[PDB]
Amino acid sequence: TKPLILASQSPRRKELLDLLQLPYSIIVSEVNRNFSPEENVQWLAKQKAKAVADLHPHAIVIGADTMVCLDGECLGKPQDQEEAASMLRRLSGRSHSVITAVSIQAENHSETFYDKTEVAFWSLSEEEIWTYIETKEPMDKAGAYGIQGRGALFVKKIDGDYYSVMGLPISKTMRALRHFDIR
Amino acid sequence: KPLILASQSPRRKELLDLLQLPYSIIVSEVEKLNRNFSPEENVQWLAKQKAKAVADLHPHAIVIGADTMVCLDGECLGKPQDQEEAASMLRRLSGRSHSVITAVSIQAENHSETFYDKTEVAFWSLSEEEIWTYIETKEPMDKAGAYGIQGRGALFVKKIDGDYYSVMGLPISKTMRALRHF
Incomplete structure (x- = not known):
């Protein structure tokens, strides 16, 4: 058996991992154009887990990363309040991944x-x-919106996993942890 | 006009709260859903009856009523009466899709x-x-179809195609949009 570590400072990932009722600890570590968004997001989740796993090699370390993409372009956490409003205008009345x-x-x-x-x-x-920008909820999230809180009012629908939108596909995480014998 | 939520549902309360509008919770019990009607007709008939019953008591108000059904192969599942029925409902929902x-x-x-x-x-x-x-924590016993999308029930859900908030009991973005018409 190995102790479980969440290599994330995200409160949403914490809340979702808590649904597993498995004891764990939280450690956050210090974080290419040729790659696709699918390769990039996988690479970043890997680097986050490996940075902590390198420091604690006896444990099972979970790392995760979330990107908001549309027409090949991905949107990160907005630096400015005007940039957050620009992202929202692009997202309006359409679908994104x-x-x-x-x-x-x-x-x-x-x-x-x-x-x-x-x-x-x-x-x-x-x-x-x-x-919505005044609430301070957009600034903390990729693509300048959160599916929880006031951001819930902008969303017409989803096709996929709501928990994955929050930052962690919890049902899949749980299924993957069973092959690590959970602990 | 003042706003009334004709539901005692804590999920509907927490969702209607997102709107930042003052409202009160007033309920008047109404029940029998006829097999001659579709589940779509029945669920709408039920949301109507619950809002009308409270609207008759508060005619100067705007009253919101809601109802949620969990259905598969035209058959809708109610709150389980016993733990053996809850396991029966979940065994039916396992490995497939429902509405x-x-x-x-x-x-x-x-x-x-x-x-x-x-x-x-x-x-x-x-x-x-x-x-x-899952049954051993009494979360199914309170819900239609013997499950909730929140909590431990989250681990059973592979995906959704629609509105998560609607599954909780209130399509909050459609309700908000519909309240602008009032």
């Missing part, structure tokens, strides 16, 4: 995968964009 | 609007151990 990769690392076993969810947005007004 | 239909009815003296939102829910194949341990 939310890609979440998970990497599970142990000395004798490693597993990396991504989950893709299609997210459809209603057509949004300028007023709704800035009043 | 979650939520109807919302907004009632006022000069305007009324009813609609349903349909979501496809796909489950992983479930073991007998998984079903009984």
